[PDB]
C-alpha cells in the first residue's frame, strides 16, 4: 500500500492467520499492529482531540498531493549561515523539485532534517530580522511584523518562510513555530474573530470588548477609520468605503468592532501573509490542510514543545543498562531538576530537535522511521556523553558518582548545542 509511502529501514509487514495486517520491527526484534509510517495507536482514555488528530493525520498523509517524489533534493547550508543559505538553496528549486527526499548537509542525512528545520525556524521566526515580532513583551509567541516592508525584498523572505513551514509539514519535520492562535486560522482561511485580538494586541482587545456591552455615546467618538503606525509616521485608513466620515455609536458597535479586528489582524499584513501562503501552498494544497482546525494545524506544524518527563522515562529503551542502575536513575534525576529549556537542549542534542509528536515519546521519530529515545552503556568515565542524532541514542558512560556525571553531561549539551 505504497500510496502512503514505503516502509522504514528494517521493517516487514505480514498478515495474521486471518489477514489482519501487522508489522515486524527488524530493529526492535518486535512486532506491532501500528504502521510505522503512520502515527502510533491511541490508548483508551485519550481525549477526542487527540484520537481525532491521529485520524486526520492519516487522511492527510494518504492524498496523492502529500506524496514524496522519486529521487532526492540536496540542501547545502552552513550552520552560522543557515538562514541566508537556506534562502538561496530553496528559493531556487521549483515546488516539484522541493517534494523529493531531503538530503541536507551542513558544510564541513535523514536525521539532519530534524536539526535543520528546528534550527532554521529559530532564525526565520526571530523578531530580529523584522519578519516577525513578539506580539507582547510577555508572551514569546510571534506574529507578522507589519513593519517588515522597510526591507524592499521582504515579501520574498515570507514566500521562502512559507515554503519552509510547508516543507516541514510536507517532509514530516517540526518547526519552532510559536505562532499566535490567529495565524493558524488564517492558514486555514477561517474567519478571524474579536477573540483573536487577545493574543495579538491584549490591550486593544479589552477596549474593543467594552464597546460591545457597555455604553458608548458621550463616552467615545470615532469613525470607520483607523490609524496605522509605521516608522514614526501615521496614516488613517478607511475600514470600509467612505469610513472616515461614518461615525460610530452604541448603534454601530457591531460593525466597527468587526471591521477593526479584520483590519489590525488580517488586512494590515495582507501583502506579507499573501506571499507567505503563496509559498506554503506551493507544497501543501490549501484544500488539504483545511481538514484540521486551528489547533490541530498548530500541532501539525510544530509538535509538542513542552517535554513530559514521565512519558519520556516511560518510553526510553536501554542498552547495556537496567532501568534501575545508578547512572540511569541519576540521569532521570538530572532531568527532573532541569527546567524545560535545559531538557529541550538535551533533546536537541540527542535527537536534533526539542519538538515531540502529539502521541508523545511513544512515537518519537528518528531519521529512518520509529526510533525510541535510547540510553546505552558506552564510553569511559572521563568521556563526555555522545549522541547519534539519527538513532536517538546517547552513549552514557557508567560514571562512578552523581556530581561527576551531571558535570560531563552538562558541558556536552552546553558546548555542543549552546542555546
Amino acid at each position: 500500500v505504497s500510496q502512503l509511502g514505503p516502509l522504514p529501514s528494517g521493517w516487514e509487514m505480514r498478515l495474521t492467520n486471518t489477514a489482519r495486517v501487522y508489522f515486524v520491527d527488524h530493529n526492535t526484534k518486535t512486532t506491532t499492529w501500528d504502521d510505522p509510517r503512520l502515527p502510533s495507536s491511541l490508548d483508551q482514555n485519550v481525549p477526542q482531540y487527540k484520537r481525532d488528530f491521529r485520524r486526520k493525520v492519516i487522511y492527510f498523509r494518504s492524498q496523492p498531493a502529500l506524496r514524496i517524489l522519486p529521487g532526492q533534493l540536496h540542501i547545502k547550508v552552513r550552520r552560522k549561515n543557515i538562514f541566508e543559505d537556506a534562502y538561496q538553496e530553496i528559493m531556487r528549486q521549483t515546488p516539484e523539485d522541493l517534494k523529493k527526499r531531503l538530503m541536507i548537509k551542513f558544510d564541513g542525512y535523514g536525521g539532519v532534517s530534524r536539526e535543520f528545520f528546528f534550527l532554521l525556524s529559530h532564525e526565520m521566526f526571530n523578531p530580529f530580522y523584522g519578519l516577525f515580532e513578539y506580539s507582547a513583551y510577555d508572551n514569546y509567541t510571534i506574529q507578522i511584523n507589519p513593519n517588515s516592508g522597510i526591507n524592499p525584498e521582504h515579501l520574498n523572505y515570507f514566500k521562502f518562510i512559507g515554503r519552509v513551514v510547508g516543507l516541514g509539514v510536507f517532509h514530516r519535520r517540526f518547526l519552532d513555530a510559536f505562532f499566535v492562535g490567529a495565524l493558524y486560522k488564517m492558514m486555514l482561511r477561517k474567519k478571524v474573530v474579536l477573540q483573536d485580538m487577545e493574543g495579538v494586541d491584549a490591550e486593544v482587545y479589552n477596549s474593543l470588548n467594552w464597546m460591545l456591552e457597555n455604553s458608548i455615546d458621550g463616552v467615545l467618538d470615532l469613525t470607520f477609520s483607523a490609524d496605522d503606525e509605521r516608522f514614526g509616521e501615521v496614516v488613517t485608513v478607511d475600514l470600509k468605503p467612505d469610513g472616515r466620515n461614518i461615525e460610530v455609536t452604541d448603534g454601530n458597535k457591531k460593525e466597527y468592532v468587526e471591521l477593526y479586528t479584520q483590519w489590525r489582524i488580517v488586512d494590515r499584513v495582507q501583502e506579507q501573509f499573501k506571499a507567505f501562503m503563496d509559498g506554503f501552498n506551493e507544497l501543501i494544497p490549501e484544500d488539504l490542510v483545511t481538514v484540521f482546525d486551528e489547533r490541530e494545524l498548530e500541532l501539525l506544524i510544530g509538535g509538542i514543545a513542552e517535554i513530559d518527563i514521565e512519558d519520556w522515562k516511560k518510553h526510553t529503551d536501554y542498552r547495556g543498562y537496567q532501568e534501575s542502575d545508578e547512572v540511569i536513575q541519576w540521569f532521570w534525576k538530572a532531568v527532573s531538576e532541569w527546567d524545560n529549556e535545559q531538557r529541550a537542549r538535551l533533546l536537541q542534542f540527542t535527537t536534533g530537535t526539542s519538538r515531540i509528536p502529539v502521541n508523545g515519546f511513544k512515537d518519537l521519530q528518528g531519521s529512518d522511521g520509529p526510533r525510541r529515545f535510547t540510553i546505552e552503556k558506552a564510553g569511559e568515565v572521563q568521556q563526555l556523553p555522545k549522541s547519534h542524532t539519527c538513532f536517538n541514542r546517547v552513549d552514557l558512560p557508567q560514571y562512578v558518582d552523581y556530581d561527576s556525571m551531571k558535570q560531563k553531561l552538562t558541558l556536552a549539551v552546553e558546548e555542543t548545542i549552546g542555546f
Binding site: 495474521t16 526492535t28 526484534k29 518486535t30 512486532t31 499492529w33
Partner: peptide, 8 residues
C-alpha cells in the same frame, strides 16, 4: 499481542 518476534 501479534506474532512475537521469532525466526529471522
Amino acid at each position: 499481542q501479534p506474532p512475537a518476534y521469532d525466526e529471522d
